[PDB]
Design a protein around this ligand. Structure first.
Ligand code: NDP
Lengths: 498, 498, 498, 498
């Protein structure tokens, strides 16, 4: 039997585990240390959660190692590994309302969105990658023959072994799922560190692995801080790969730590300052709707959020006019209320940063059209924000807000290369977008944009089959798609002479 | 006119450039600094070579960046890029005797071997990767449709941009060729740092890129030190990828340097301590020939050299007898003598390391069966060496010699898993081999060996089409094969709604 | 409400549809015509089954065409098509005992074997291909650019459209599943003709498509004759692809009919006379076990069954002795009885053919070591048979028995190429096998065998992920694996200029 | 020493072989039979050409078989096969002017076009496929393991063996090259039947295979009739694959002949009635240029020629006015003259057919806007022709002309689905095209068009890397791209247990 924090809310009875998940059981951290997880709708403590220590990390890694080297996960058929991951997805589907509610409490995710995206996409992720298990294939290669003898060369795709996954707080379950699904589908075992501020759906997910029959030690979950738990994972001599999603500066440190220990492999999904270029020949009403969504989706807590909108001179003023109209219709409120469409920010420290971000925007001369402030109510709500007259030298033109802040610049009618240059003048390169009805402009702009994803007449259209990752200082490696598997596999070349 | 060091040798008049190669021109380093490159056959100075400074690195990177962004290389068809790389191979083949002679002089490479391997495989590498240019393909992906609308998702494979390549001294031209061919085939431009002790074939190669019509600035070559030139490449804000081959310790530092600058991509080909397991049911005389080659090839200066031979008890002593008989037949001498089997070690400091390595093996209790010291003669020759009674705890059982030192341990008759455990008990993982006539042992042992390459009934059988790279602390990423391309390409996902 | 033939057998109540399945409903054939399906255990009539006429084929094709062009199947996401096929697999697994019992009745498949293979592999087939749906991907291709303009070239994989599947009687459900799973995963719709003598699992499968929610018209099943129903499918102007498994002579006629109508695509899985070469250095007892299995599995009604065994001279007599010892232990009986090893042949005409086959073998001078005759008991049982002293000119050396008849020839000790020549001297090339502990022989022999599958130290080891198809007159195209999809897809190239 | 027909023309000396090419030597046909090849510029006889008989086919097939089974071609490394084909491409380039001049003489190809396309693309084809040789790769597949044992499954890509290639006359050398390059790159040997009316570049190409060092027997060339030589290739028991390009009716017969002999593999590139849909939002001047090119390229003797132009109501008359203006500017004349941009039709029978075809268009009520007649000069020149008021039921709306005949229909403004239906109402499906600046219409139309190639804002843009083939009665299988290799390879599955 497992200890839960029980909570009657959203017409359900939530049963939330709150302990470390190690070697297939929920256990207290070393010394029974704990910390509070905060509900962002009202600032209250949801419950106490175990706080992993170094010795807990070592225990998690040991369990992962044993499960890989000697446990059932390392022995079963790829096909049957796949069956287990499908079953895991089914179990997650059976708990989708409960998971979405926990995500609503823990991260302020609007329930209807959490159900469709945070949770729904997590389910798709496990089903998608389950299908890959018995379709991961190596090669036979026609090398030169050592005459009078013959040669056969083949490759085998093998798991990398024990992995660490370190994720952020914006979509707690979904970021976990993206990376964990690829990791497990490739035959690895894993120690996962959720963002300290959002441990709850991870811990519930841990319980669901038990229900699905995932062998003990294959999935291990350690709520705790990056500087302690995350750091130890990156240092550990038995971890052979880190999968990381978070800020560029922590990414740099993680990669450094991978190097200095045992050259463990690393993938990095880092920040974004993603440009959206809106031409006069677009469908303007659709540009407003998709433009809205590109910034405000998931309260702007979205690595690929459009961080600059460049709007062609002749439609700029009309675009801003319509954006303001639509911004005014947004209902701000409790994520559990069905009419809510803008929930609170994830946690307090992030709310503070958003306040400062907008102060600086105003200080440096941008026009604040609306918002920019904490909403006066309990919790950590932030008013949807629109800036105009944003110039390329400005802080808010360079730096990622990760909040609901639309940052608008003009470009002259008929300029294409000039706006492209401005769009590309960033060390980020995670995503980008273009709205235009012109085929030639769409294709040309998408060649020239220096970003891992280019959206054309849409935005935020991610898919579990479509690889997702950055260029330049947005990192390297893919989540999602066939390409994701490559971060979690190694290639062995086997060459015979006969 | 290019300045040459001219040398009448080996029936040829070598014309050897000696300066930095930047933006299509041979130029002195800052302050006209130079250093000596040393002939390992007699310890004489071959000539002075420009010694790149930081400002020279910055110039080379600036030339590479301009060549990629605005030069011809970034505009031509993939197919036409292929034609240029094929033509480069042709030029290399037209100069193959000269390149092999230069390699004999600079690296102590035995001339017959240098023709066939150092130079011959370099030519194969360019031809092979030339064929890939117009066959690098992205995907179209059946994502979920945003009904009532439609979606098209495709991927585009793009170059990474400016690359730095840092290589070692054991096969100067060939290591350059492996990485550079893949790098250029993928459409990138490059700054190459050859090992300071072996700049000459790299500089001759630079001139050949001119004869081949490779556009100015696509290839830049900077002889100089790792800690100065190599460091600046890893730190440089406009370099987007480092391809590295060398020691594990420098590899760690390189990766750290990529992290701390701009999270540039990195691939690491690091040390080996590769195990060769020889069973009693093998063809013994063949095992002796291949066993010897697995150690002594290219005077042991070979990252995949078998660093331990595990020989089944019942054949051990006969195996050692035959090896000693064969070792006595090896002709040691000048790399230009056509009957030379064994040339000098690459440079003086390495010879001294090899003397110390062998003193240490004796001191810790291994049996010196033959060799173990510098051959008394001018230059830097080391005796082919055989150690027996080697035990798992010993320094020479753990550490990579990178010299012609056969390190033999028995294993028990009819044991398989126990020898595998010993073979795997290393943080290296670059290569390995197994000699056996038994199909079941061969397949099982190749599954279980923790190494990027497993040779079966052969050794050193690399091939331009067969991917080559390590596991664990031997690094990550592949040179050669289709797989090598992936270190030099990025994936852009382009998603339409219509 | 569906009409069933109800039968209480095997501790179950079977509910067997017996009508045509067209447009999602069970309906009588034109003029309510029927025929008898015969239980091979006792010769009794199981029930009457609808006998499809030309007008019924036309109705089924029309239903398939509507379902493809206007129905849901053609509109849903590839991912959701996948979900439906995974649901179909679950439904099949929920009914596995029932399906295996029906197959035991209809085909004489030993129940324990039918659970694991006839039905078990069918279930695996749908799960496997279900995973392919959203992972079938086109390409983006780096074509030459019409400078000063640009080009993008991509490929789209599209369904072929309406398909006909015509299958034999040896594994009724499994052969249907192999082809139908791939066909449907590629987004096609289908009309299936089971072998007239074995319609029952096909019809039950049809009902399971309803339970799984496969849209109406996607699957249509027509019990009936090849020369009427199969022929009309091949001739139909709206059918775009025929998938055929059966005899070489019918296969010729099918290909010819695809030609003369509308050059519909065709794939052909035809006969076999597969050689199994057993060397003296094999594991003898293992060779006996697998040798027997290679012939007797599924009462020899197995297209890849070893049709000749070549046994090295020095182990031949001992091999024959051991086979005879093991043959005597086989338990012949009712397929529903748990101790049964060897069930009845599929139908009477086939039994008659096997009797004649063995009469001819004795007549032409081969040594009948055992069997050769109908077992004295009700139904259509045939004694496991062993022939020795078979010479290459004999009829039984050339002709496919498709029954439990082991046909043994000797080869001289050491005579590798000579035995290969003998093994390849056939216009068939479906499968082949070699038993040897010698890696060099195994690799060499497998290069030289002219067959689509080579087994090494095993036999009948098929897998839903491993492609299966013949060379020469055994046909072309694959069932199973990624390769099977290509038969059911078309490639559209799309080339933009911008 | 080879016998040539020598001719001083176009500033060079042609040296044209005129005999059969068998087993690496030029030889007379049985009974020294010959026939005349006719120059379409003046109706004169170029020379006499050997006329292959049945026994010549058998000799060619036997040479091909021997070259495959025992000659060097079946023994050399894949890489070295690649070198030979790249050398063949070089030799072709060295003879580019001569080949293009022969093509002008024999087929009426305008010399400047022949140099760039007929010959230029042929050279690209061999270079492209040469690069594939050592990059053709099989798989290793994670099949279910027969516990407590292990399984390894790999696939080997092998040559099919002796192939027959039968080609049409519209681009003699280029059709030969497309198919032959893919065939040889895959390791096969081949017997080629050029169109009887166009043997000369094929025979010169045969001579170039000697200069390139292609082993004797690998390439064999048989000028002669389809009904005799082609038929025997389809029937031959030793031919294992036919590659065919030509009319639908002959394709049907070829496929039938493949079936009835030995189920040899077959690919079919058949007729087209390719629709080009021009929207009012296109760049009209560019649409006129590309539209004209879509019809008139290579005097309309082009399988992918737009056989039907649908032009949006509002631009229709202006489009027709502009086409007529541009047609008046075309220079009709000797293909060797540099100002010629419209050469003669390929042969006399085809000119007649075009004359009759246009009579029929006029008779059935289509408006003949210009052309329709033979040009009053020597040879077989036909006027660039434009029809308007073409109705869907008309013969000329349904039948492929294969000549320079633009066939125009209107469609209503804003119709999209209606025009698509009309464009898709054909049993052909080889190519298609759409001109529009609207991204949404372009993507949607290319989804809906039922053809193997869709051009968007261009036409005739084929590329050696882009697969080319038809849907429906336009056939199946690809020429060009990676996909083309699949017609010329077989997959062998090899499964070990250990
Ligand atoms: N899809 C594609 O890639 C292409 C298709 N084509 C198509 O070809 C047609 C125009 O050429 P056309 O001359 O009419 O084509 P045909 O089908 O009449 O001839 C093509 C080739 O087939 C040969 N042939 C004829 N009968 C037989 C037979 N019984 N067995 C074997 N071979 C035979 C011909 O020989 P012979 O010399 O005696 O006539 C010729 O070499 C058009 O429909 C066009 O669309 C053309 C080019 C490319």
């Amino acid at each position: 039997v497992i200890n839960y924090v029980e909570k009657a809310v959203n017409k359900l009875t939530l049963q939330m585990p709150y302990q470390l998940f190690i070697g297939g059981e929920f256990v207290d951290a070393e010394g029974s240390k704990t910390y509070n997880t905060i509900n962002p709708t009202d600032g209250s403590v949801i419950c106490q959660v175990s706080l992993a220590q170094v010795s807990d990390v070592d225990k998690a890694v040991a369990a992962a190692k044993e499960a890989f080297e000697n446990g059932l996960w390392g022995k079963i058929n790829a096909r049957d590994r796949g069956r287990l991951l499908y079953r895991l997805a089914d179990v997650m589907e059976q708990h989708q309302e409960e998971l979405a509610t926990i995500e609503a409490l823990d991260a302020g995710a609007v329930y209807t969105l959490a159900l469709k995206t945070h949770v729904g996409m997590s389910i798709q992720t496990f089903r998608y990658f389950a299908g890959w298990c018995d379709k991961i294939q190596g090669a036979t290669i026609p090398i030169n023959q050592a005459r009078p003898n013959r040669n056969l060369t083949l490759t085998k795709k093998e798991p990398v072994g024990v992995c660490g996954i370190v994720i952020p707080w914006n979509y707690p379950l979904m970021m976990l799922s993206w990376k964990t699904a690829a990791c497990l589908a490739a035959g690895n075992t894993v120690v996962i560190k959720p963002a300290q501020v959002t441990p709850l759906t991870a811990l519930k997910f841990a319980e669901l692995t038990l229900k699905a029959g995932i062998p003990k030690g294959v999935v291990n979950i350690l709520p705790g801080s990056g500087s302690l738990v995350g750091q130890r994972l990156s240092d550990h001599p038995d971890v052979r790969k880190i999968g990381f999603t978070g800020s560029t500066e922590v990414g740099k440190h993680i990669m450094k730590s991978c190097a200095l220990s045992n050259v463990k492999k690393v993938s990095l999904e880092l920040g974004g300052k993603s440009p959206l270029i809106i031409f006069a020949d677009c469908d303007l009403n659709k540009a407003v709707q998709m433009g809205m969504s590109s910034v405000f989706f998931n309260k702007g807590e979205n690595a690929i959020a459009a961080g600059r909108l460049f709007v062609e001179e002749s439609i700029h003023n009309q675009f801003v006019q319509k954006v303001v109209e639509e911004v005014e219709k947004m209902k701000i409120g409790n994520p559990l209320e069905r009419d809510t469409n803008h929930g609170p920010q994830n946690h307090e420290a992030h709310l503070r940063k958003l306040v400062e971000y907008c102060q600086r925007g105003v200080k440096e001369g941008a026009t604040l059209v609306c918002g920019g402030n904490q909403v006066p109510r309990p919790g950590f709500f932030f008013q949807p924000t629109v800036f105009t007259d944003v110039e390329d030298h400005m802080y808010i033109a360079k730096e990622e807000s990760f909040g609901p802040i639309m940052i608008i610049s003009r470009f002259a009618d008929g300029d294409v290369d000039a706006v492209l240059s401005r769009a590309n003048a960033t060390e980020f390169g995670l995503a980008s977008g273009v709205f235009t009805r012109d085929i030639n402009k769409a294709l040309y702009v998408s060649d020239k944009l220096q970003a891992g994803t280019v959206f054309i007449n849409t935005y935020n259209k991610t898919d579990v089959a479509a690889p997702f990752g950055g260029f330049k200082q947005s990192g390297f490696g893919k989540d999602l798609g066939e390409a994701a598997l490559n971060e979690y596999l190694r290639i062995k070349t086997v060459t015979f002479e006969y």
